[PDB]
Amino acid sequence: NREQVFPTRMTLGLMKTKLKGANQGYSLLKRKSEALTKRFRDITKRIDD
Amino acid sequence: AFIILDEVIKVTNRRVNAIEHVIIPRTENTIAYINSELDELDREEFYRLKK
Amino acid sequence: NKKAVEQGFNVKPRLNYNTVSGVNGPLVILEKVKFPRYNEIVNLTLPDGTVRQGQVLEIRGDRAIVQVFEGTSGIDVKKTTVEFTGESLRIPVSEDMLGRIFDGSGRPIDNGPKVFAEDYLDINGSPINPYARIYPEEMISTGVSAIDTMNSIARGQKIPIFSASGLPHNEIAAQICRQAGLVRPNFSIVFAAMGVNLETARFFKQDFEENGSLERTSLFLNLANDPTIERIITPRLALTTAEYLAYQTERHVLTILTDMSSYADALREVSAAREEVPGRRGYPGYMYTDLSTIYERAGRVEGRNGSITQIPILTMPNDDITHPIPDLTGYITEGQIFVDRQLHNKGIYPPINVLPSLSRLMKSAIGEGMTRKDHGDVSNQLYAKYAIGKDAAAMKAVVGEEALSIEDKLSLEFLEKFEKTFITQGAYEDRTVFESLDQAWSLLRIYPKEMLNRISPKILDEFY
Amino acid sequence: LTTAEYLAYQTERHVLTILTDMSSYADALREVSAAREEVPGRRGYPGYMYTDLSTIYERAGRVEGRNGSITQIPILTMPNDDITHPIPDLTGYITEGQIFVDRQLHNKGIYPPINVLPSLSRLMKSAIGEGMTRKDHGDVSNQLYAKYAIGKDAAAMKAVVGEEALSIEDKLSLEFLEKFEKTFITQGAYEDRTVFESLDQAWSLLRIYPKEMLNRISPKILDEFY
Amino acid sequence: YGAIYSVSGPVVIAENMIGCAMYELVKVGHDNLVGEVIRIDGDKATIQVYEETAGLTVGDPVLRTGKPLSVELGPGLMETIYDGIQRPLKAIKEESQSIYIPRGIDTPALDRTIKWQFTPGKFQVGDHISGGDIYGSVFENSLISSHKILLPPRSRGTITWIAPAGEYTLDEKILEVEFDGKKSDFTLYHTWPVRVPRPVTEKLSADYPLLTGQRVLDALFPCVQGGTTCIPGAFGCGKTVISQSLSKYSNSDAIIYVGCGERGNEMAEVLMEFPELYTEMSGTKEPIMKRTTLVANTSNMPVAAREASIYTGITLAEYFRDQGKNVSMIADSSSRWAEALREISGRLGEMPADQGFPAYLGAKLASFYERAGKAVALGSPDRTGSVSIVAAVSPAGGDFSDPVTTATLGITQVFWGLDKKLAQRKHFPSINTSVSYSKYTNVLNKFYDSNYPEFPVLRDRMKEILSNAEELEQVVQLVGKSALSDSDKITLDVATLIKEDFLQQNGYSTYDAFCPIWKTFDMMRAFISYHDEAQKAVANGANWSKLADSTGDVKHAVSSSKFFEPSRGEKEVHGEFEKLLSTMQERFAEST
Amino acid sequence: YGAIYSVSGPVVIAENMIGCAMYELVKVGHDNLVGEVIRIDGDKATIQVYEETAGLTVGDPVLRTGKPLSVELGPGLMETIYDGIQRPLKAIKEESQSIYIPRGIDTPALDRTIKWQFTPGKFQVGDHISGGDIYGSVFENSLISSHKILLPPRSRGTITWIAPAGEYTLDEKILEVEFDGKKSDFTLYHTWPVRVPRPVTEKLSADYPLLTGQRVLDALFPCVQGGTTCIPGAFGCGKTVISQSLSKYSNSDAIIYVGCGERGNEMAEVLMEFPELYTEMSGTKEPIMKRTTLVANTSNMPVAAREASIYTGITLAEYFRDQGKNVSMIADSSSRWAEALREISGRLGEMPADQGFPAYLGAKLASFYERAGKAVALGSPDRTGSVSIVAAVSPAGGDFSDPVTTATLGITQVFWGLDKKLAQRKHFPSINTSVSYSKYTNVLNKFYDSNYPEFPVLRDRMKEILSNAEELEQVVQLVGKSALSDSDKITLDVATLIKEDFLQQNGYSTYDAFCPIWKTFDMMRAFISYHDEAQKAVANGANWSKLADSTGDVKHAVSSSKFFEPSRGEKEVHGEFEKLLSTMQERFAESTD
């Protein structure tokens, strides 16, 4: 339930950078999933037509 | 296009869930533990300086 | 008959030391002390007439560093008068303590008389001889399935209740006290509140009164308003009373030490008042020993029919096992009952997460003789399948519900019907251990006979 | 601050003290504290840095009988580009706002390299009003902040879902972000922009949006100024 | 008497101080700077002076007050503005004619020049008197009339002489009590040590609620007179609205607002807004300041003052509780107080415990919160006051993992949870219903069954509706919204209506300034009845879109249930709510 | 006899005590509390007493024994329980008639009333005798027969008189040595200072394995007879149960179970269960307790006595090694010993070093763990004993970064790390197969080649399977199981089977309480053969899902091999395993066909 990181100030900064990047990637990928799902709904409607 | 798009959407949703439920909690727990250990080292240094 | 009376009929004058060298924090230092003891509880008289008790902690030549439980506040060099009793802190105990409410330091707040002492026992106590101990092998049917089947409390067990700040640990502890009883045949509860809220103390007192336990309960209430230094001695006083009533009276005693987190916070405050080692998270390096002198007063002894079961109620700060209070208490005590905020938010009562919970004294005190043959295998299998359920729930959250296998789906169903129907209980519902085991066998019969790999083949054939 | 107190309160004039390198001031506090036998606090700085910074900062403020004011621009220097450091933490506790200078903006040649997303003034509603500034100030600032956040989101979104798949409210927002960073935030070091000229530039930036899109602006101000 | 021996920053060592007590306030220096005694080593007595210590030379006399840090309890505490040390800011400004606080200013904490009307109590000469007994009454304000004069809790004995009715300045003798020697002479005031809680005969259970007026606060997350709550208290979260409401629209007969380390312009804002308040307790509008005592305490004040601000406030609240008045204490910037305590601990050199906070922070917080509660006041006559502590945590660094925030959340039974995002979304009072909670519902069930029996189940069902709507919103974000069933659509619509009308209360608006408990109960009844009617219509098989089209009138009536004015009150609003329930049932049934 | 100057916690600074050496045993107080001198600041001499300091007064006399803390070695201890300062708890209970240990009770460490049948050794009158030479033997009990009486080290000379065969107490003279014209009288017992290790002729490389009985400990991370061991883990991980099972079922001839900072109910459980258990060694069923002695120091006992208990236990183990017996000392918690050291250092006022633990903690641990090792005893006749140290380090907070854990891992050779995620969900032993290691596999290759040749290759295959499946488990937790290949599916399934059946060993069931070396080897053979057969069948082209559906019976038979009773004998069970493998091969061939 954690990462085997040696406690250090540099390691703390690296892990904060990792958390910020992961949050940014999570928001970006959630928005991309929403956009792709809108495109997918359009695609399936065109499939029915 | 429908099949490829569905596969890509499944992969992307899986990766979003994986991030939000593993990477964010694991990194947050690592941050908390590193902060606690840094506070512990600071407290040990404080006690040594007090001595 | 009893020769302890003869030494009682002796009067010992006490020296009143107006010589107070200095005072700092909670520590008041005396000078010109004539042969100071190491734990002589003194009676320090304030200039205003208030009398606060204190015990010396370090005694250099002609010097004694007294810490006062009520606090130094108001102590003046010129007017304070400190008399040395010449003996360590001794609680006046008797069989009449049962049914009386005492303060943090043992002074009766029940509006009744001072306890008519039958003996004066040192609160610090003595270690029980390990050769004189008896391994607790008598199961207690607490009535709650999560503690009786998954875990198991013996009679001499000292299993605490790990919980967070807002969890219903108090309601669980009161449930155990009102339902505790030997599986194969009463408990004189000794309750020690340390820094609890008035609401918590009132709840415990009202529960005992309404369940009738107040006729056999001796409360040692140390509220949050009470001084923070006598939280150190409140569990000592209650445990000395319990040790008396158990070993020297042959009464089975439940010792409920509420807010051991508050006790340990008082311990850290006392340590930080001195130049003590900071241990981990600021708690003293001797914390383990202190908590040992608290917890290890439980257990049964050879030749004496009494027993003491300690159910300390911890308050983990951030619901973290790794915190020093839960870690040290788990290292010392003989198990733990892990109250879970996740299950409490889910709405389950009792909110016991059985995975972090454990009981050393299940090994013996469950089996073919104490209860039915299948209990150990059933508990092991239930633990395994509950963990598989939690892991499969995490996998479902990560990668959707379709990717799960048949085993994962079965394990999710088991998890749902185990948390919903087995762990969950009413506040006043008591389940016999056999009924709990039958529910457990229903939950295992969710599975096919092949997947119950922790069940022995004979038990599985005879019980499936 | 003693000079500021004198001028503002015994002379009735407005001051605007501009302190510089309060990180250097905290280092001097560290040196002075360790000159005595004081044990270092959280990050080596004394435990009373909160008190010292509180005195220095709260030396300012308006008063009742005197028609003078003192304003402060402490101007910190964050050591490792973090707010968790004691100097920024305490400065944010005592003070009443933040203005953030960003390395990302500085590396793009944008002067002043101030990013308006982390920066805020808690007392902005009082300063930006109708009798003060011009009556569109608050709504214009809120709209600029919202559209700048949308511009950053769209800039991150373009490299993920392509430029074409962006909505109109994302493409126009990208254009607004480019014009905002390269013309509004980007200010000549010796270019004096009054509040009215800056607000006119802000309206010029906002005018690329049709009036229907500007939603944080009140209808009356939108109908009058657009 | 005493004399200075060593000055190294705030810490001062004074020699020739034999007989000086611990934590006792001493007048340090020729300017009579106030400081307490930290430790004693023989003659010496380490003193931490409160004000700035520059200029104190060796040989400066150190007069010993003889008493610990004490609150100046008496008439004239009500509409004054104080600090942590309880120094009158208005009187200091008037006396010094300067915007600054002169160093070592010793203005009396209560107005001695003002004359108070004193009416002797039931006690007469020769009758026994005990601590906390009311031996007189003083007319102080219009909101707070008959400011009951209390014998000091420690004092007791036989009454020797009691002053007759008339006007008497706070500093002159009012009562003489002989207890093994008539050494007691009592004025209109008494001094009580701040750290020592004022004793009570018995501390009852907090049963009656604290009706703050805000619908969400007094419906879903209620607080009790004598209960302790918590508030995030961050910037731009509605903390001002919550404080204003609790100050003027609550049940409290008195208000103690403490700042304990707030920012200068925030203090300016609160001390400029509170005198502008008006509470319509009587027919004529009168200021809320007539019943609200301020402890104004910025960051320039001594760290000792900032650490003692909440203690002084709770002692004032305890005093007004001993008079039988329900008191509400708003402890803004509790964390600021914790930071001041940490700074004091660092000055001591005491070992840090967690994140640098002292070892005893949790114990001090628990004791301070336990000092709050309903209690029957000491001595005769029997009267039961209560102290409510509403402490805005204002976490340091914007995180709830701080030791002080964790301790406050654990100890306080109610968390009201102002939401910064919801406040930014133009919502008031911006209460995050997902994280806010109240543990006083179990004890309030008695009052609710006594007055409004269905209110607990109504609020529980409203919380269930909101939680189900959150789940349905998550589902509608994950997949298509139209895939949701009719029941889910009704849940979403009714919960959106509840958020818009029931939860969003406009303080500025006249109709929603203070919604009484009866009107809140009636609105809960109306909303739950509308939800039940919609659920019954769905069960009947009617399309939800058609049902909404037909019952738009009932929905408009439910929305206007906000707009019903509590000015008429009592049966007029209740009767109109009874009529609204009849219309809702009829229109819903007609659509079927 | 000096006075007392200060009593702060467990340390007692004693004034007017010039002439007291470092680590000299003293009798502090009127109750004669046993203590050891730490510092000597002139006249004063700081003393760490091994009893409770409550009631000590300034001025109370302190006597200087003139000796270091000395354990008492000889017949008697084998089946007893002690108290760190080596006070027999049984004798204390009988003498005091109370359930508490009296303060400053001075009961002899070894019972003097018992008469031991002494048979003189090969040394006769006039023959030169050196330190550690065996001049006789006594019958301690049924299991420890011929408890060889060793002449104390550092003592040499010519035997002037040796007692004949008969029954003697410990006080009676047994042998007399003349050295440089000075006669020395030797008895059945002799005291040895615990701090100084007992001398040996030459320490040897350990080559025989210490059969713990646990499957994972025996196969994956083996330990030798004479090798140090460490078992870190949080509370509830299983270090205590692992230690108790090792003491019950190890092949070591003698067990020294040391309890430092361990709850007394564990000592009671040992004292109750060990007599019921029986050892198949010595040709007859003899109780385990006849070869196990306990050095019990409960957590609530005096703080300073934990170090004394460690040293007493290791010195008893060294004595039984010098007798030629393969001993295995088991410290309950070297971490609790280290916590006691930290408490003493903080009471003294020394520099905290790391986490408050004194700066000499690493050196003390290194010395204590270097006490262990296979060695030839000091004197004739030639014999080769050993001492294994299985010490359960208990980290604070469950983090293996603790100073005591790091120093213990630096000094030890075997790491049986415990995972709490496996401690929960009842997966004992909770040995974390990833971090755990054992550096004795290279030296045990000889034993494996001698007895079970395929043991190292099967063990390496199991380690590879577990590591590969751990990587695949990370991959599947990240991106699901759809991407994994067939062989990946077999690897994951077989490793889950291994963890559920082979590694998971219930120490309190009849079948898996003690899995012997041959049963563990057969089970590795079965599981590895199952993995190989599944891999071969899938490589032949059979779909893994259908193969699993068809061979569920074989998988259940493999998983149920842990239920085979070791009591049935090696011949009977090995036949059952051979039949299981044959039927497994037939079933896999039929499924493939």
Ligand SMILES: Nc1ncnc2c1ncn2[C@@H]1O[C@H](COP(=O)(O)OP(=O)(O)O)[C@@H](O)[C@H]1O
């Ligand atoms: N091999 C095993 N078989 C069965 N149960 C075990 C085994 N190892 C440990 N346990 C269980 O773990 C529990 C905790 O004991 P243990 O973890 O050994 O104490 P410690 O916390 O000192 O390590 C015991 O109740 C025991 O039932």
Ligand SMILES: [Mg+2]
């Ligand atoms: Mg253990």
